[PDB]
Amino acid sequence: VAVSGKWYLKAMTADQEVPEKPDSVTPMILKAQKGGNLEAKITMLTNGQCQNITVVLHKTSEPGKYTAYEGQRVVFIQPSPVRDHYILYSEGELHGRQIRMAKLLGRDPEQSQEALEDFREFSRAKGLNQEILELAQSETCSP
Amino acid sequence: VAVSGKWYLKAMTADQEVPEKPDSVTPMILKAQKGGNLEAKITMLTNGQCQNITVVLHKTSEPGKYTAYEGQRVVFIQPSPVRDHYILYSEGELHGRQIRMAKLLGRDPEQSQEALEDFREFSRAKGLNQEILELAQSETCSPGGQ
Amino acid sequence: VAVSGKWYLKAMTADQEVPEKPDSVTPMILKAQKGGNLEAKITMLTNGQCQNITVVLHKTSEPGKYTAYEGQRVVFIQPSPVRDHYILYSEGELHGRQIRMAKLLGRDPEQSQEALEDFREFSRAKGLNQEILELAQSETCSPGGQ
């Protein structure tokens, strides 16, 4: 598993308004599990509160394709042309609503203009035309 | 050395009041060199601008004892009782002035109450009896408009 | 000519403490003149005041070597190994003092870590071991109370 380890969630976009937008994010850890599954852990600062999220990504028979939220969501993990970056694209149900999302992951926290421009091209091609939000980063989350 | 690698500068105090009042700091990198020397690199955000500092720490014959600034300053690298923390203590010339400083380093950015309480005792004992500054942390420093 | 046009002064270092350190800078314009000379125009914000500088760089017979400040300074202009960046290194008199400086120029205002790391190697090799200041960028400069 190459996608294993420490990642920075640097940018996100979607097909719908996301009012669930964080104020800061901790690094994302993807832990490789039995049977090719991935456990994603991240902490988000939303409304003064540090919310710790854990999402298990269930491996399918298609490489790079995962399910989550008990099948209500399909997540595609694709490499960026730009080094040290990966793109998540997801479809299906989140919090009752049905939303398509893209997330830009990087090994490094440093902003990459090149990775962002590529993330824009990818996203707008998939018909995600909302704003691209580049997320504030913090190694820890403080109320 | 054990001290090699990535550190968070989590707290600092001094004998004077330092004009170096950062708004955030990047991690401190101590890079091992030929002959047991250390290159200390850190970046500080001050008023929209990034101060990229590099200090070569010249190994002496005394473990934990280093010089810097052409012998004009002495730096003691001392382990904390508390796990994954170190204390830097320094005496001599910095930017022309005489100043003594203590800095608390940790492998993790999470503040440790135990490490901080010990760093307070260390500081008060050494006559670095000003306020202890806990620094804002950022993995990067970017100037305004860059 | 290669150096002509719009630059961002992104980083600066020196061999002496520069107390006259800028808080913000406008872009540097290098205009090519008759006979291979260069007119450098920049505005710097220093303690609420705008320094509108025009420096004529007088071409010599040595490629990349210029004099300026009515002969009080010699300026070496080299490309950076890193793309879309240039390095100025200068020796001589500034504000009634002897001081050696390096300046990192870029076509883009966005930080390049590669250009900065290279600028450090270049500077430390010329014995400029002070902090590398990465400058805040502004299209305009306005004095306090204007």
Numbering used by the authors:
A (entry chain C): 29 to 171
B (entry chain B), C (entry chain A): 29 to 174
Give sentences from the paper.
Eight dog (Canis familiaris) allergens are included in the World Health Organization and International Union of Immunological Societies Allergen Nomenclature database, among which Can f 1 is a major allergen (Pomés et al., 2018; Schou et al., 1991). Like most mammalian respiratory allergens, Can f 1 belongs to the lipocalin protein family (Flower, 1996; Virtanen et al., 2012). Lipocalins share low sequence identity but have conserved structural motifs, characterized by an N‐terminal 310 helix, a C‐terminal α helix, and a central calyx formed by two antiparallel β‐sheets that enclose a central hydrophobic cavity forming a β‐barrel for ligand binding (Dartt, 2011). In summary, the structures of Can f 1‐hIgE Fab complexes revealed two unique and partially overlapping epitopes on Can f 1.
Results of MD simulations performed for Can f 1 indicate that the conformation of the N‐terminus region of the protein is very fluid and it oscillates between the predominant helical and a less abundant extended conformation. The N‐terminus of Can f 1 is at the entrance of the β‐barrel and may play a role in opening the access to the ligand binding cavity. This is supported by the results of our MD simulations, as well as crystal structure analysis of bound and free forms of Can f 1.
